[PDB]
């Protein structure tokens, strides 16, 4: 085997024991360890583990500060070379040149791999977790000085590379196989944004533009908004604003669907509205927008809407089936949804809520340290569970949709504001009262109401057209 430096002058040479590292039961999986041992394995000389690097840089801030991480990898990087050996001594004493076989082996098989893996940690750090440096200018200065003063031409290529990457990140185009489908119009024509509404825009183009909107919001959520359960803490507006934008858009849409329904007082027109919303749901299923599917299902299951028996009695049979299938996605703790998600061909937009509950329960359900032999080891299997979840999230953020944006329909949906100036409790009561006005409790008789929509209520359907 190969000789390491003294543990007194290089801390990362301590032998593994159950007092500093614990493995799970073809490289090993770590269950717990000290920071030193975690960093040693993060940059081991034998094998690379890129999934371990992603797990560590995602979750380390719960057991170690950024300034201290940088100090520790700078320390791991400066490896002391060995002294000349006996065969080297004897050669020099005859004026010959030493073979230096063990020093050359130590450089090639220990120092060089450990130093590249340290640089690789730095590369991933800067390239995928640059917010540590945005929120701390001193940390960035140290990183630049560390990288900028690495001598030795074995490292030169990656040192020049990481310098350029850090400089780009500081100041800071899609290809498809197919062409995107033609944008579909119904009663509202291009540019006539004042006429835009649920029944005047084409239901295909509604689902498409909402899908693009929600996909952009989904793809914008970074793991810094999730780790530490920070979207639930007092500072969640600072720490999780892209996550909260997404959730609030989802809530707006749901309330907009509820409002469209219960503010349509005429029963025949309301059935048209409910039927159109179910047609939009169908296109969501088509486009794999599960966030949109659950927006619609949440609206149907809300209190103001779920009780409208007279309206749902008159819904076409085929659409009760579509809505009932979509609702079954959520039964049994989202059993069928999880299955469907893990079987589709992306792009998709997942439903974020499930991930949120799983991350939070994992963080509250597991101890942050393990006590072994009077030592406090960092419980790393807990951090791997959390990074497993964030890795699933990131996987569905890679694939873009092949759909044209229509700016005006996008702007219309971005600016939707069902609640207006009212608080949630007032607005929620308003919706429920409207529901009791337009379909009173039994045995009070079912009133009649005049029509509000002047234009035709016939759905143009959810099969796409295609002119030349």
């Amino acid at each position: 085997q190969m000789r390491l430096p003294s543990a007194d002058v290089y801390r990362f040479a301590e032998p593994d024991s159950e007092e500093n590292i614990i493995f799970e039961e073809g490289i090993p999986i770590i269950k717990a360890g000290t920071v030193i041992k975690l960093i040693e394995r993060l940059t081991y000389h034998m094998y690379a583990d890129p999934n371990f690097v992603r797990t560590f840089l995602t979750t380390y801030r719960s057991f170690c500060k950024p300034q201290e991480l940088l100090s520790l990898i700078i320390e791991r990087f400066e490896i002391p070379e060995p002294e000349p050996t006996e065969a080297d001594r004897i050669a020099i004493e005859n004026g010959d040149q030493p073979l230096s076989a063990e020093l050359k082996r130590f450089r090639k098989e220990y120092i060089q791999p450990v130093q590249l893996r340290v640089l690789n940690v730095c590369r991933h750090w800067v390239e995928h977790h640059f917010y540590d440096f945005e929120r701390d200018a001193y940390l960035l200065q140290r990183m630049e000085e560390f990288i900028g003063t690495v001598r030795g031409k074995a490292m030169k290529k990656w040192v020049e590379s990481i310098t350029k990457i850090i400089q780009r990140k500081k100041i800071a185009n899609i290809t498809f196989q197919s062409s995107p489908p033609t944008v579909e119009w119904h009663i509202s024509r291009p540019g006539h944004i004042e006429t835009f509404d649920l029944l005047t825009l084409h239901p295909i183009e509604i689902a498409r533009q909402l899908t693009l909107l929600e996909s952009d919001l989904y793809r914008a959520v970074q793991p810094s908004e999730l780790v530490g359960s920070v979207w639930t803490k007092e500072d969640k507006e600072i720490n999780s604003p892209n996550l909260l934008k997404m959730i609030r858009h989802t809530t707006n849409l749901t309330l907009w669907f509820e409002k469209c329904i219960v503010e349509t007082e005429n029963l025949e027109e309301r059935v048209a509205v409910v039927s159109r919303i179910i047609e939009i749901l169908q296109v969501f299923q088509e486009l794999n927008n599960f966030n949109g599917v659950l927006e619609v299902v949440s609206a149907m299951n809300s209190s103001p809407v779920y009780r409208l028996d007279h309206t749902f009695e008159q819904i076409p049979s085929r659409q009760k089936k579509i809505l009932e299938e979509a609702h079954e996605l959520s039964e049994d703790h989202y059993k069928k949804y999880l299955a469907k998600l893990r079987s589709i061909n992306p792009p998709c937009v997942p439903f974020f809520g499930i991930y949120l509950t799983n991350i939070l329960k994992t963080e509250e359900g597991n101890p942050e340290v393990l006590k072994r032999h009077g030592k406090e080891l960092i419980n790393f299997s807990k951090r791997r569970k959390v990074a497993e979840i964030t890795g699933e999230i990131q996987q569905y953020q890679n694939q873009p949709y092949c759909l044209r944006v229509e700016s005006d329909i996008k702007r219309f949906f971005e600016n939707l504001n069902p609640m207006g100036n009212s608080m949630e409790k007032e607005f929620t009561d308003y919706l429920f009262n409207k529901s009791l006005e337009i379909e009173p409790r039994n045995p009070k008789p079912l009133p009649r109401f005049p029509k509000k929509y002047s234009y035709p209520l016939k759905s143009p359907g959810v099969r796409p057209s295609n002119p030349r």
Partner: protein, 166 residues
């Protein structure tokens, strides 16, 4: 055997999720995984009758406020949780109860008020105010500890009795 569907509701950011976790988790070790099938299902014996508990806890999803009706509608009994060091969550209890009543279309739904001690900060809701609120609603009051598992069986078992005796 009978299956009860319980729903935990209440304000987020104050340790609500400790309840279901401490209930289910092999409460003599800690390696917890919410991902796996039936880490929310639990066979128990309550008053000699064996039954199966199905716990829906959507902690973390509190900002999806338009999804509450859908989640609540699935349940036969409700655990209404506040944190004893957070007055806001205590005052929110009223709106949660009015919302439950509305999606069940009923004025007596089986529910329990649960005051949860989630750390070592100072109590700001006294037992007395909580008892009085619980008495005014006609429901049981139970206090639990998020560290020591105290009161966690009592909270769920009480709710099952509340369902059985409806």
């Amino acid at each position: 055997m009978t299956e009860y569907k319980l729903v935990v509701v209440g304000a987020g950011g104050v340790g609500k999720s400790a309840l279901t976790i401490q209930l289910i988790q092999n409460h003599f070790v800690d390696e917890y995984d919410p991902t796996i099938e039936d880490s929310y299902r639990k066979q128990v014996v309550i008053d000699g009758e064996t039954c199966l508990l199905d716990i829906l806890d959507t902690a973390g999803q509190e900002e999806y406020s338009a999804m509450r009706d859908q989640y609540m509608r699935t349940g036969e009994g409700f655990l209404c949780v506040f944190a004893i060091n957070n007055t806001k969550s205590f005052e929110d209890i009223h709106q949660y109860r009015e919302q439950i009543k509305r999606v069940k279309d009923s004025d007596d739904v089986p529910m329990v008020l649960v005051g949860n001690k989630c750390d070592l900060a100072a109590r700001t809701v006294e037992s007395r105010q909580a008892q009085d609120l619980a008495r005014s609603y006609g429901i049981p009051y139970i206090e639990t500890s998020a560290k020591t598992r105290q009161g966690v069986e009592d909270a769920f078992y009480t709710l099952v009795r509340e369902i059985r005796q409806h």
